[PDB]
Amino acid sequence: AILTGVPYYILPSTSRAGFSPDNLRKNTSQPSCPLDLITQLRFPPRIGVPVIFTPQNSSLKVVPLSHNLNIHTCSDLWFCPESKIWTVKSSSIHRGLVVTTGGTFRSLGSWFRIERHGDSYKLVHCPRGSTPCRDVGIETVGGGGRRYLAPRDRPLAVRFTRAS
Amino acid sequence: AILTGVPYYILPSTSRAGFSPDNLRKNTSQPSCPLDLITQLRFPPRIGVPVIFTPQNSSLKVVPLSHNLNIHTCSDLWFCPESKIWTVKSSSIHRGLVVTTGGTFRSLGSWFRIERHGDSYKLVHCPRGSTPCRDVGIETVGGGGRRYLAPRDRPLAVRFTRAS
Ligand SMILES: *[C@@H]1O[C@H](CO)[C@@H](O[C@@H]2O[C@H](CO)[C@@H](O[C@@H]3O[C@H](CO)[C@@H](O)[C@H](O)[C@@H]3O)[C@H](O)[C@H]2NC(C)=O)[C@H](O[C@@H]2O[C@@H](C)[C@@H](O)[C@@H](O)[C@@H]2O)[C@H]1NC(C)=O
Ligand SMILES: *[C@@H]1O[C@H](CO)[C@@H](O)[C@H](O)[C@H]1NC(C)=O
Ligand SMILES: [Cl-]
Ligand SMILES: [Cl-]
């Protein structure tokens, strides 16, 4: 029921507090975005900015579970020079790997999968498009009060809302 | 001088018809942009969309001539999932190499230089950030009635107008 190329909001399974790339939150053009995190919109809870899933297998109209895909933010506004494509980067101040935008389609570090998590789903990131994959969850360390997505093997249960 | 991190319009030395990434001319969301050309705004001539130059030593305040740099489009609107960073791609439809957006900062394929050319300048693209470089000029083949930038060793003389 997740469709290739269609925008969805990623939301926590039990919450209305969705997610946005940092650059879209800050409303300001910058000359580079070395660590454009995906952060939760909490005060008040806001739906965030949708993403699109692109399976590694290009013929697929339905996004399969447990299979390599790219994610990218769907937004006509963009305040970074880098891409809208999600990837993972290491950050010393955030105490390890974090999800960011600025990736490259079909690159070795670009691969995520959607998996079942109880009655919901979870996102995982798969280095080099292979297992072992790390669960994507919410972290706070180094986030200056914000909650950001990171592949640290603690899953955040998510639901998808079609953005149409 | 040409200043780092300051937006400039690239213009032909003797014309007001500047340049824009194709996705900005279309002004609608795209699922992907495999070949986002930089095309000339001719009829009527319009100044285009500015760019920012980032020298390979990104700490320099003046952009050096004859020295590797990245170029990216300066725009808050962006209709592609891929980056605003310039690169070169092969296109059989366009009978060879073409300038496009969707590059990656500091990547092998990302390097251009600004060189003096007569009393004006030219852009060159430098495979792997090394010489020899190929002069960037204007082409029409496969362009559907538009002119696009391509590194085919016939230089377009250009000037740079600071955007404000
Ligand atoms: C070229 O493309 C851009 C980006 O799509 C257009 O700007 C966008 O126009 C929308 C209207 O078609 C604006 O949507 C409104 O947003 C608010 C708040 O989210 C809603 O409450 C409201 O009901 C609309 O949905 C959108 O904000 C705007 N985006 C940006 C970043 O500016 C642009 O349209 C032109 O400018 C804007 C400001 C509008 O006034 C349009 O009517 C106008 O055509 C497109 N340009 C052209 C020439 O078509
Ligand atoms: C960005 O714009 C939104 C919507 O106008 C606003 O509510 C928010 O506080 C702004 N963020 C910053 C950092 O200015
Ligand atoms: Cl990972
Ligand atoms: Cl070249």
Residue numbers in the entry:
A (entry chain B), B (entry chain A): 1 to 164
Extract from the study:
The fold of CrataBL consists of a β-trefoil, typical for this protein family. To conclude, the sequence and three-dimensional structure of CrataBL show extensive similarity to protease inhibitors of the Kunitz-type, although the inhibitory activity is weak (in the micromolar range). A number of its biological properties have been characterized, including delay in clot formation by impairing the intrinsic pathway of coagulation cascade. In addition, CrataBL was shown to exhibit anti-inflammatory, analgesic, insecticidal, and anti-tumor activities.
The three-dimensional structure of CrataBL was determined in two crystal forms. Both of them were in space group C2 and contained two molecules in the asymmetric unit, but the unit cell parameters and crystal packing were different. Further analysis of glycosylation by mass spectrometry and protein sequence determination has shown the presence of N-linked oligosaccharides at Asn27 and Asn57. However, it is not clear whether the dimer observed in both crystal forms of CrataBL is biologically significant. However, the observation that CrataBL is slowly cleaved by trypsin between serines 58 and 59, located on a loop that is involved in direct interaction with the active site residues in trypsin and other serine proteases, lends credence to this assumption.
